[PDB]
């Protein structure tokens, strides 16, 4: 667990320092030196938007790809004794490809809204641009992570389906119902991401 | 309104007689020692417990905080 | 004196940012490298089984 111990030690030190610094700012009655609005407002909406777009596409691929290896190994392994498996159980990977597609469509619809500002001083500038910027980030994040966990779910289930089908060909059809629920999880994330950016404008 | 002297007279006599006179009027059976022990221990612990409770309420430094509607109700109740 | 400032380093944010993250990266590299040697696996074989 050498790496996990390293990750934890950094995690704890990271937040432990934030706790000490945050409480100290309060204790020493600093003039709101830690200004969240300043952080959020100076950070260009272009950064937030493009981050969400990259996440929407990239996280969705990670999910699909995750599931791909989960069911790939199980299918290939089982097939050593049950070559019939490839006839039906490859649909799980089709399910993973569909999970990846979800993010791609959303990511493109979001990116289509990107525009220049030619803006400088945020004061009374781009009020709508900030809303749309943050929304694009959220919607991208929303769908990305939703597809990320969707792809993992359908992978795990497809593995079980292949392992079952390898032993009894009558089980595949009934089990397949679970993977459909998994796919729906990703679609729900798509619906919200669409809503979040349904009423945004640049310029 | 109440005085403190009278409560002391009433409850001191009550528990005093129990712890003082009670043991005087006890059967001579095998439980005599137990009955006397119980009578005295009971009177002393009970008297003290009350005595503390009442003394702690003398010369109070502050009164209670009541809700406005409660205060109104009391004004026209007591 | 007069509630005067001490001149809080012009470009502080730059020197600050640099020194913190430079020494953090170097310190971690040393910590990890030191750990890996500290916990070097000798193999616990060849002669160790007999000496144990």
């Amino acid at each position: 667990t050498g790496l996990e111990l390293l990750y934890l030690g950094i995690f704890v030190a990271f937040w432990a320092c934030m706790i000490v610094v945050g409480i100290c700012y309060t204790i020493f009655d600093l003039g709101f030196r830690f200004d969240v609005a300043w952080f959020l407002t100076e950070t260009s909406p272009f950064m937030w938007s493009n981050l969400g777009i990259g996440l929407a596409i990239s996280l969705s691929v990670v999910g699909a790809a995750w599931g791909i290896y989960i069911t790939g190994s199980s299918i290939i392994g089982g097939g050593v004794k049950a070559p019939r498996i490839k006839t039906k159980n490859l649909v799980s990977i089709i399910f993973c490809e569909a999970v990846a597609i979800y993010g791609i469509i959303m990511a493109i619809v979001i990116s289509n809204m990107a525009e220049p500002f030619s803006a400088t001083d945020p004061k009374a500038i781009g009020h709508r641009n900030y809303h749309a910027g943050y929304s694009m980030f959220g919607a991208g994040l929303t769908v990305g992570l939703s597809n990320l966990f969707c792809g993992v779910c359908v992978g795990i289930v497809g593995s079980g389906a292949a392992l079952a089908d390898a032993q009894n060909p009558s089980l595949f059809v009934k089990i397949l119902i679970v993977e459909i629920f998994g796919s729906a999880i990703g679609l729900f994330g798509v619906i919200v991401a669409i809503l979040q950016t349904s009423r945004v404008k640049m310029g | 309104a109440h005085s403190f002297a009278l409560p002391v007279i009433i409850f001191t006599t009550f528990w005093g007689l129990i712890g003082i006179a009670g043991p005087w009027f006890v059967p001579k059976g095998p439980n005599r020692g137990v009955i006397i022990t119980m009578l005295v221990a009971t009177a002393v612990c009970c008297y003290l417990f009350w005595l503390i409770a009442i003394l702690a309420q003398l010369n109070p430094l502050f009164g209670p905080q009541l809700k406005n509607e409660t205060i109104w109700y009391v004004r026209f109740l007591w | 004196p007069y509630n005067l400032a001490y001149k809080y380093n012009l470009e502080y944010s730059v020197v600050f940012n640099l020194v913190l993250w430079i020494m953090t990266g170097l310190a971690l590299a040393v910590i990890i490298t030191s750990y890996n040697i500290w916990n070097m696996d000798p193999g616990y074989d060849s002669i160790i089984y007999r000496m144990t």
């Binding site: 100076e42 950070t43 260009s44 950064m47 | - | -």
Partner: protein, 40 residues
């Protein structure tokens, strides 16, 4: 101040790359080879 717009935003983008790199490298480090081969 301790941070500027420039420095801060730079830190944020750096972290995203560090998170991805860490994940990638982690999976790369957790790679083993075989002790022995099955047969002739």
């Amino acid at each position: 101040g301790f941070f500027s717009p420039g420095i801060w935003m730079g830190l944020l983008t750096t972290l995203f790359m560090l998170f991805i790199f860490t994940y990638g490298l982690h999976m790369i480090l957790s790679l083993k080879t075989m002790d022995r081969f099955d047969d002739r």
